């Protein structure tokens, strides 16, 4: 009574990402897929039990009942598709069976790198943070290499205001001789 | 409502013979609703040790029950089913024969 | 609609007892809790197909339910333990085959000491004038740091006001330590606004992190402020320089 | 042989003491294999070969989901007396079930009466429902909005039903596959002069017998219809009149054996 979809994908803004899900068993009512978001609820998304795609927009899900084999196609991938899609099956007793989750990541597509390291200074102290900015989303960031030195996962913001959109890092550092430079390694 | 009045059929396990124990039945079918209420009669007084099936659901909807004792016949003891029903203003009984 | 579930945040010191909440007025035969962990699939703790009956899922040790109405299914910690540390959905369907509607959840985290609870130190860091030179654009970070449990929501506030465009919060908190189990948790955030917007000094920039800590009710025999459920700000004002 | 796997739930509004407002048996073929009522809230065997192959988990399960159905019944039934504006006590059927059929073939079915009379007939091929006047025809067009609900249901008749109907098959094989072949006598006068010729069969499995009168068929046939005979076998009967000196026999056809009385 098993169930399999990858840990992590990670897609560019505007393409393609199909999210396989196989599942072992003796017993059928249907598979699911569930929109996770970070922090919020699980959402219903698809309902397949025949085999065949169902499409609603920019999203389509397969299943193969003799294969044990569904997909969520998303297609046009956008920035809020960024979250967890959960697939599910109704066994025999009608247990719903519940997949670990995808985490989907979308890079979005920065036209105009800008890669540029910033030093911002605190409103009441000195103590100073780092900023990483307006780096290609093809870009990793390293972790820290010291204990003292604190490394933030990137963060897509996206300013409407200007059309535009930015990853950015942070880090950050009581020591009184580090520099944003050494920074992001 | 279409309410169905009970088919009453009495009879006996295996083929007849005087002294030789057998087992009464009353088959009660094709009757609605489910409510119904069944005695056998040696003689027209009720008898104490009946046995029956639980309701029985018929794919047209309607309901039927066994009704059976087990029973040694003889020349002079009459045996029947009384039944009764929503459907009867009395409860009826019905004889069993050969 | 839908499935109202309370609370969202919760620490218990281990052995307290806690009920959370779970409702819902669509007419739904089925609730569900779940429990949500790192690396694997809801995992249902009871359920419920109708008022007058509740069933163990495969995690039921440690809890308890009860369906006495349609519309309410509140799960009961007996006595709490780090093992219960998780993110607890409950979830209602018509029916056994329906789709389930989900609650926001509950955020709750059991440690062995109270005195590990702490509330942020919150910062506010100006834009770099390098950043406003080169870009035309201003980022403000911020710095949310030492806390514990991680449970806060980190929202900014302009001329007294929440905003959401341009704003990024990183997903989850990062650990001061991440050998410890006690580990305090920091969490950074961005805004970023036209140059010239950063620039008009008619502008309030307000960094609010509403914490999740002990109650007002809680007994306290340390020196420091008993860490209480609070709102912790930093801000910035708007400055041409 | 056909075999046959089916549920019924029975609905009952304000019945009388006893009588329970709910209760859904199981059958394979005319053995019932399982019962649930609103009185024992529980599901249990109704077939010692069930209750030896299915683990507790399995009843602890179904009486949850049992328990569900008869909360949904007592609405839908509640619902319909609203919808004809019906006072006191109606019923509430529901029977589903699939056929497995010797040429390997399938069968689904599920259908919903009132009053013992048919309301709700479901097509599992075009996706629709059959109703027989107004308050049915919109409980249709309520089911038909919900795509996934319908496709649900085809799965379960053509799928689920049938791998439930196969393994009920395998638990209880010595019950339900066996035969026990019939005794057929034919005795004989109905009134003075006039002759009737009576053709009996007893203690045979399975129930379905085919049993007729021919010269060398017969008009006027007299059918006795199949009955219990309370041991798990069967008895039954063909009697006919004879124009007072044609040659006649009895056939009976039984489980893969065709017999002839003359
Ligand atoms: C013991 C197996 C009791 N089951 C039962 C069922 N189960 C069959 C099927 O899963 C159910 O009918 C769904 O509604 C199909 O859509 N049905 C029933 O009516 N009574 C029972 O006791």
Redesign the interface.
Known sequence: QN?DQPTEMTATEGAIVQINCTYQT?????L?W?QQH???????LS?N??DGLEEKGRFSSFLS?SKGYSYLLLKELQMKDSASY?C?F?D??????????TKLIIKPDIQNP?P?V????????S???C?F??FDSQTNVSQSKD?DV?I??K????????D?K?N?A?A?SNKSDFACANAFN | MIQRTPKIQVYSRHPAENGKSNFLNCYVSGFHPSDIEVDLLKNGERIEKVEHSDLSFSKDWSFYLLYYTEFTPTEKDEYACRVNHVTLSQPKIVKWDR | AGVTQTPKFQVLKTGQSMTLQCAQDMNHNYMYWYRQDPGMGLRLIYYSASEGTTDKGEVPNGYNVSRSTTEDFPLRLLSAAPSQTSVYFCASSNREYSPLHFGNGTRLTVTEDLNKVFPPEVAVFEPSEAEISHTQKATLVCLATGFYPDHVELSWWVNGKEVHSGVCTDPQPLKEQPALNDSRYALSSRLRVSATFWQDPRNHFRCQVQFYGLSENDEWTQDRAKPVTQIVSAEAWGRAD | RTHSLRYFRLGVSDPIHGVPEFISVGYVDSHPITTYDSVTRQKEPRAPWMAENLAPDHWERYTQLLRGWQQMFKVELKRLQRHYNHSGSHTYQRMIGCELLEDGSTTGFLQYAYDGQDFLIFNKDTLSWLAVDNVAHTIKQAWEANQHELLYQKNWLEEECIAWLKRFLEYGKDTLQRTEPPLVRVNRETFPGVTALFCKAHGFYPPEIYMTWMKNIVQEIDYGDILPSGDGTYQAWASIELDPSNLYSCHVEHSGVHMVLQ
Do not use: H
């Open positions: 169930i003796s017993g059928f009512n249907g699911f569930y970070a922090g919020e609820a699980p959402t219903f309902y039990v025949l009942r959960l599910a109704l025999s007793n009608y247990q719903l069976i519940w997949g670990a989750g800008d540029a910033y030093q911002l200074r605190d409103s009441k102290s103590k100073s943070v900023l900015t307006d204990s604190y933030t996962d963060c897509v913001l996206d300013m409407r205001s200007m535009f930015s950015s942070v950050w």
